[PDB]
Every structure is written in C-alpha cells, then in structure tokens.
Design a protein around this ligand. Structure first.
Ligand SMILES: [Cl-]
Ligand SMILES: [Cl-]
Ligand SMILES: [Cl-]
Ligand SMILES: [Cl-]
Ligand SMILES: [Mn+2]
Ligand SMILES: [Mn+2]
Ligand SMILES: [Mn+2]
Ligand SMILES: [Mn+2]
Ligand SMILES: [Mn+2]
Ligand SMILES: [Mn+2]
Ligand SMILES: [Mn+2]
Ligand SMILES: [Mn+2]
Lengths: 78, 97, 92, 104, 96, 108, 84, 99
DNA sequence: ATCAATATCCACCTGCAGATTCTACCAAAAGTGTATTTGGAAACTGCTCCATCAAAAGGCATGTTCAGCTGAATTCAGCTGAACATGCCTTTTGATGGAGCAGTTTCCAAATACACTTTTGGTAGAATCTGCAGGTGGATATTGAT
DNA sequence: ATCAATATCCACCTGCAGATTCTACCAAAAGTGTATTTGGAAACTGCTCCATCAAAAGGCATGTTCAGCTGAATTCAGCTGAACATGCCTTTTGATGGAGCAGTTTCCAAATACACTTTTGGTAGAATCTGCAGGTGGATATTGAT
C-alpha cells in the first residue's frame, strides 16, 4: 500500500518544499519516514478511539493525536 | 523539437505547487495506507472521512516542511540535490531521531 | 448541541472588513485558533495560580499568562485590550 | 444586558466563564478573568482577520479562505512565532525559492 | 513555625534498597529522582485530565490513568507499567 | 474501630497511595477522582523509579561507586533507548553527556 | 551598586572551547566564539525574562530557583535537580 | 626534543576528558555577572537565590553542549571537521529556534 | 544580445453550481436577586538568605609563536536524475442500499464526595556513620620522531 | 620496527563533608456513617460509513537521451591548534547586616450556591452570490541558432 505513495506525488511534495533536484533513493527514504509518521499519529488516535469505546476513528481523535505529537492542526475541530 | 533544459521545468513546478494548497498525494492510495497501518493497532475500525483528511493534511504539511529542512541541508553541503543523508540529518537535528 | 465561536468570529470580521466574507473551512481554522489560544492562556493561568498556591484564576493570572505566551507587540496590545474590557466592565 | 455588552466585547464573556469553570483550571474563577480572557481572544482574532482580509483583497477575492489565513500568519513575524507549531489545513506554504537554485 | 515540605525521597529510597540493597544515593541524585517522579506524575495526570474532558467525564479513574500511561510511555516501559498498575488495582480491590 | 491498613500496603506498594490521591484531587485534573486511580498511578511511578534506579545502580557499580550520583542517573537514562525517549527533552543537572566521538574525527 | 557592562565577554574563548569539547567538537573556526555568545545571550534573555515574569507575578524581589525551573519548563528545557 | 603533539591530538584528548566529567565549564562568577546584567536590563532591584543562578548555568551549559553536537553534525555533513557560524545557524534553523 | 519558433503565463470576460448568507423558531445557557462561605490581602514580625567585603592563592585566561594540515578553489568526466513522448489502468466520483453504530433515554446499584474523629506515617533537625575526593606512585599505554 | 616523552590508569590511603539513622511531634491519611452522583446496561434510532457497480480520465509507469551535477584528485595560502611565559582575577573561607521571604491572624470584598426568569445561540429550510474553470488573444520566457 505504501508503494501507493508514488514517486511523482513525492516529487510534488518536494516541489512545494522548494526542492529542485531529487536523488533516486529519496523516494524510498520518504516512504519510510511517512510510515513512521502515520504509525505514531494513528497509534495515538486509535488509543483515543478505544478509550472512548468506539469503532470509528474520529477527526477529533486524529486532532488530539496530532496535538500530543506536537503537530497541532487547525480546521477539524481544533 | 523543443526541449527545456534540466531544472527549468523543476523550478516551474516549485512555483506552481508553492502557489496552490491542494493535497499532492492521491486520496484513495493514502486512505488505503491509513487503514492498513490502523489495522495493526485495532482490527475492524471505521474512519470518519474528515479523520482521513486531517491525517492527510497533517502528513503532507509534515513532509513538505521536512523537505524544506532537507533542502537546506543539501545546500549546506554545496549541493542542489537532496539525499537520504540530508533527510537523515534534518530528522536528527529536529530530535525525531 | 455543538457550540462554536463562529457567530463571534464573524461579528469581529464585519468590524474590520464589513466587505469581506469567510469560507466554512476558514471559519474552521478560526475556531481551532480560538480554542488553542484559549487552552494556552487558561493552562498557563492554571499553572501560575498553582505555583503561587492560589485557588482562583483572576484577570491577574490571565494577564501574566498573556505576557508569558504572546510575543512582544501582540502581548502589549492584548494586555491593553484586556485591562480595557475589565475597566469598562466594572464601571457600568 | 449581557456581560459582553457590559465589557464592550463581541466575544462571549458568559461562555468564556463557563469554559474556565468547567475546564478544571482552578477551584475558583474571578469575575474579571472571563472578561479579560475574552477581550484577548477577540483582539487576536481581529488581528488575524484584518491581515487575512488584506491577503484576500490583494488576491482579488472578497472571501477569506485558509490560504489567506496562512499568508497572513506566515508573513507576520509575531503571528508566525505564536503559531509556529501549528499547521493551517489547506493553507499551503509561502512561495520561496533558495537563491542558489535559480538559473544563470 | 516549621514550614514542612513533602517529598518522595522516603519511597525512592525504599525502592532503591529493594533493587540494590548495597547502594546509596547522593542528595543531588535524590533531587533528580524527585523531579522525575513529579514530572511523570504531571504528565500522566495531565493526559488523564484531558482524556476525561474529551469524553465528557467528570471523574478520572484507573482507566484514564491506564490509557494516559499508554499514550505517554514508549513500548516495553508501557507494557510493564500497565501490568504493575493493573495488578496493584485488582490487589487493592480484592481487598488484597 | 479496626486497625488501620495503609492503601499502599493494600495495593502492595512502597509509593504513597494516599499522597498521590491527594495530589490528584488538589491538582485540578478533574471534578472527581476514582479510588483506583491513585493506586494505578502510584504503581506506575514506583515501577518507573524502580527501572531507573536499577540501571543507575549498575552504572554506579561499573564506575566502582556504591552511591548513585547524577552522572549515574544520566548514563542509565541515555543508554536506555526507552528512558532516553521518555526523557528526551529533559536535562539532568550534573549529568554530563555520553562519551561519543564521531568516527570521521579519529586519527586517519 | 556598580555598573554592569560587557559581561558577555566573561564567557571566554577557553570556556566555549571546553563546551564544544563536551559536545564532541574537534576543530573550531575563529568566528565561533562571537556566534556562541550571541546565541547564549538570546537563550539567557528568554529564560530570565520568563523567570522574572514568574517572580513579578508572585510580587517578590527575589528570583527563585523554582522561577527558573518554571521558565525552563515553558521554553521546553525541563531541568531536574532544583525542584528542591 | 622538544616533544610536540600533532594538531588534533590534544583536541581529541579534551573531548574524551570533558565527555567524562560533569563539572560546569564556564567560570562561576563571570556567569553570575552576566545573569545579573541581563536580568537588570529587564527589571531593576532584582535578587537571586544562589540556587537560581546555578539552575541557569546548568541549563545554559546543557543547551550549548547539545547545540555544539548538532553543529558538529552539520560540519561533518559539509565534509568539514571545523565548526563555523554557518553550522550553528543551520542547526538552530532546523531546531526551529530561528527558521 | 538578437533572431525565431515554442510553449508558458496572463489579463479580461463569462456562466452556474456549490456554498453562503438570510430567515423563522425553540431549549439550554446566561443573567438576576439573595444569602452565605471564604480565599488570600493587610498588618506584623520571626529569621532564612542574599549582597558585600576582606584577603590570600594558584588555577587559568591572555597573548604570541610557529607551522601542520584543513578548507577553499580548480578541473574534469562518469553517470545520475530531468525532460519527454507513449500507452495503459488505478483513482475519481456518483448513486444506491444496507447497516454497523455513535448518541439518547431511564432508570439505579456502585462508587464518590462529605463532615468528623482518631491514628499514624513523615518531616525537621540532632546524633551517628562513612563513601570517596584528593594525593601519591609505578604499571600501561599512547604518540610521534629517527 | 624502535623507543623517548608524556598522558592515562588503577590500586592503596584516610579523615570529613555529606549520607544514614535516630527522635519527636503533628499535619494529613484512615476509619465511619450519610448524602449524591455516575457511568453504565439495555433498547432503539437517524445516520454517516463501507460496498459494489461502472464507467472515463487524467495521472502514473516506462524507455530514451543527454545535460550538467556530484565527487574525486590536486594544490596551497594561512587559519587554527599546541606550547609557553605572565600575572590577573576567580575561588575559597568567614563574617555581618538586614532585605524580604514565610509563618500567623484577622476579616471583608468577592466568589459560590441556588431558584427562577429571560435571552441567545444552534438548527434546518430559503434567498442569494463569489469564484472556479474555460475561452481567447496577447506579451513573456526559453532555448536553439547567426
Ligand atoms: Cl545519501
Ligand atoms: Cl478577577
Ligand atoms: Cl478508579
Ligand atoms: Cl560561516
Ligand atoms: Mn537487584
Ligand atoms: Mn480561610
Ligand atoms: Mn581537506
Ligand atoms: Mn559530458
Ligand atoms: Mn510512627
Ligand atoms: Mn580519586
Ligand atoms: Mn437568535
Ligand atoms: Mn481563474
């Protein structure tokens, strides 16, 4: 599934980041980082889900997860 | 047969994407990865659509920000090309490692 | 149920830009903003009072919390507004 | 005759009070605290809406969208410092290209 | 006219003898140990407090503490902390 | 009235269950605090100070000392992956740092 | 009392070298010493500013170790060892 | 001879030495003097518990040391062994102390 | 810098749909009017601690020499990563239903908060104990020159 | 491949600044007998959430070409490390005065608690509108070529 995050899409992110030239190994490196990021955030969110005894991860769960990870996000209930 | 020199179109893409705000990762593939990772912590979960969107917004802002630091690290090494080495340095200084 | 600062953000929007509107998403951003700063001021005032073994959060804790949290000019003006509203509130 | 009108504010003093009490911050809450806190929140909100409104106007838009809130925050040294650990969904980033990457 | 200030020194010292009967601790080290306990206490309580608030709950139970501990501690540290906590509670309730 | 049993002894703990329960009620964490909460928290706190004292005592041993000092606490924290992450934003006064020289810097 | 001036120079070249040594640095360019002083001063101002703000709020004239400890916690530089 | 250690040898001796110890590296009085000067520029007539000055020195030194490690990685990354203001600035920017 | 030929941008308009803004109404807050509780300010003042001073000593900060070897420039070419025309399929997206499920109610037995009344567990010093900081000295490297 | 020159270790020693214990209250747990909630436990809804289905369309995966970037190899001016001579000023030790925390009381202005009375903000349809997404048509910016 993570290979689903494609080279060109990673190129795009790098572009919005101001990157001009990209090494061929960046794509796999980026996927690894992206995965650790999602695991960390989702783990916390699901923990808020489970605590609330729900079967549905809510935007709020993610928002609270992001806040704990020092990644505060505006736009989804805080 | 017209052809742009290497770097010319790249610079053009930077200007385009730094101008917009649309998510840059295709939605379905991303949603698929989110659910796969989540499945390892708790089975048979459902997701509010906005939950998936928050994660993608958070994820892409993080990656874009991370690429900026990586870029700064590459330039610091007299390069114009980013490498795993640059991503690694940035994450180390950020304390993510 | 489900209350938000929308009504209020919008009113304030009209005073500074009577001509300008605001999208739903942008309104969502403003709500997040207000909730966040509210939590930060409140939390700090909470600590200030606890550090000083006080059981009540007065405008004095809110002010110091503001000085501790907002950068320079933002802090000056916020403080100015804060004491201004308390002054007016106590007079009449 | 509400406390807000008395305080001369648009933001809800009565609600800020209920939120301070129900938020487990302290055992008691002074009467001025909600007024002060409410005024601070309204002011910062006016600051962002002002600058964000300007960003819209300078884009030939009349409706403020996330992009505008991001441009206002990031182009303001103070607002940026205050929200440096916050991400505005759908706001993108400021256009900026490292000199060394330009042509010729 | 004394002004007494509490501490965890007595308890830190007991746990020390349990793990290293032969070992002592300087006051500076005990100072560090005290800051540590107070710090993790605040982090756990803080997280428990938030958790309860997000769930419209007015009371913090062993369950909030448990989920707070899982959120705060990394891998193995969490698993073991949860076991000790759970154990202590069931013991405590079993009147044990 | 029956003879008093401390909640700690009931919980089978060294850490003060009563103290922790009081600290919880007076810390403005919630309107009310459950009876198990202070027990569960005292246990986790006791377990964590047991884990770091174990590793610190060992560092003391390695440095041939019988008394744990700040430096021992540091060596134990920074050398343990999990404690290091948990206290990754913490500074131990008089702890110094782990001896560590980047390879590129050694005599070529 | 007596005018306090230029005390930043009290942070000597050898003291900065020692600090870089503990930080694992083998070689140091001549301009490092002035950069370091500037960074130290910014760091110190911000912590002292917050510490003194906690001092003033308590209506005290004496900045306490706790004032500094709270200032550091705010700045995300938690310090163990002075919580007394 | 006279005997002379090659440049770099003593520097490495110093790294090992200071990474072994935990004593504060900046002289006490001078540092207390700096704290008093900065404080005074913020609020006159302030007093300090000796303990408060030490908490600050412990924190400033832990901070500088950590910053130098980061600076050192930025230099090595530039294929250098000599830290420069450039590296400190890169480290601080990535640390988010001054993007 | 021009000459020329691609492709890129870039204003100006323009037409609708997706949102916004505007209305029309009800419970859940918010504002009152009283009646008490109480937190913590004001008034001493006991007394830790902080600011200063004196003074002698040697650990270190300063400066200066000198030259090792590191950073800064150059040059060069092998080959990685950009730009692209191609061909194809995974992402979009739009209903259509069915359903797993957040959200609400209504009780209530279990669990907490209370207000007192005893009972120790802790904390603040004295009274005892003792690692180990500092000093010395050969055994052991560790370096750097022939 | 040696050895001087020094730096680095490790073990042996010994009183004392810094732990460990020993004592004594007393602040704050613990034991009890009531007075509230509280958070479930079932029972049922209106929904947002998966599932397919089913097309089409960009958007992605490929294979080519080669521009130009990264790295390796060489130089070399001079920055910065190692050593030394000098002697300044941080450290140490103690002694005081008294500023200003901290401990205690005394006690109102101010906050908590109801019991109601009004009022406003959250909802769910209804009446506009701001841009998005195209459409030209016109200078621009690029890159090949004199
Ligand atoms: Cl690499
Ligand atoms: Cl108040
Ligand atoms: Cl419980
Ligand atoms: Cl530089
Ligand atoms: Mn053991
Ligand atoms: Mn009272
Ligand atoms: Mn070199
Ligand atoms: Mn070529
Ligand atoms: Mn006893
Ligand atoms: Mn020794
Ligand atoms: Mn209304
Ligand atoms: Mn358009």
């Amino acid at each position: 599934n993570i290979q689903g995050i494609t080279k060109p899409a990673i190129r795009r992110l790098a572009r919005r980041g101001g990157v001009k030239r990209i090494s061929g190994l960046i794509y796999e490196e980026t996927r690894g980082v992206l995965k650790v990021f999602l695991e960390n955030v989702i783990r916390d969110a699901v923990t808020y889900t489970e605590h609330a005894k729900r079967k549905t991860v809510t935007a709020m769960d993610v928002v609270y997860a992001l806040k704990r990870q020092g990644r505060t996000l505006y736009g989804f209930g805080g | 047969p017209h052809r742009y020199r290497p770097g010319t179109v790249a610079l053009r893409e930077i200007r385009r994407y730094q101008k917009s705000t649309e998510l840059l990762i295709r939605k379905l593939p991303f949603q698929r990865l989110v659910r796969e990772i989540a499945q390892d912590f708790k089975t048979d979960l459902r997701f509010q659509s906005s939950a998936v969107m928050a994660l993608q917004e958070a994820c892409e802002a993080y990656l874009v920000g991370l690429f900026e630091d990586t870029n700064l690290c590459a330039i610091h090494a007299k390069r114009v090309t980013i490498m795993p080495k640059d991503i690694q340095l940035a994450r180390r200084i950020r304390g993510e490692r | 149920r489900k209350e938000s600062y929308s009504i209020y953000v919008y009113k304030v929007l009209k005073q500074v830009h009577p001509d300008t509107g605001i999208s739903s998403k942008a309104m969502g951003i403003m709500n997040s903003f207000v909730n966040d700063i509210f939590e930060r001021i409140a939390g700090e005032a909470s600590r200030l009072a606890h550090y000083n073994k006080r059981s009540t959060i007065t405008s004095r804790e809110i002010q110091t919390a503001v000085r501790l949290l907002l950068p320079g000019e933002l802090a000056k003006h916020a403080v100015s507004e804060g004491t201004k509203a308390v002054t007016k509130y106590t007079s009449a | 005759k509400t406390r807000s009108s008395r305080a001369g504010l648009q933001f809800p003093v009565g609600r800020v009070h209920r939120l301070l009490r129900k938020g487990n911050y302290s055992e008691r809450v002074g009467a001025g605290a909600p007024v002060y806190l409410a005024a601070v929140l309204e002011y910062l909100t006016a600051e962002i809406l002002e600058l964000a409104g300007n960003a819209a106007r300078d884009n030939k838009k009349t409706r403020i969208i996330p992009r505008h809130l991001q441009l206002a925050i990031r182009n303001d040294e103070e607002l940026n410092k205050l929200l440096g650990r916050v991400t505005i969904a759908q706001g993108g980033v400021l256009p900026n290209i490292q000199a060394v990457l330009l042509p010729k």
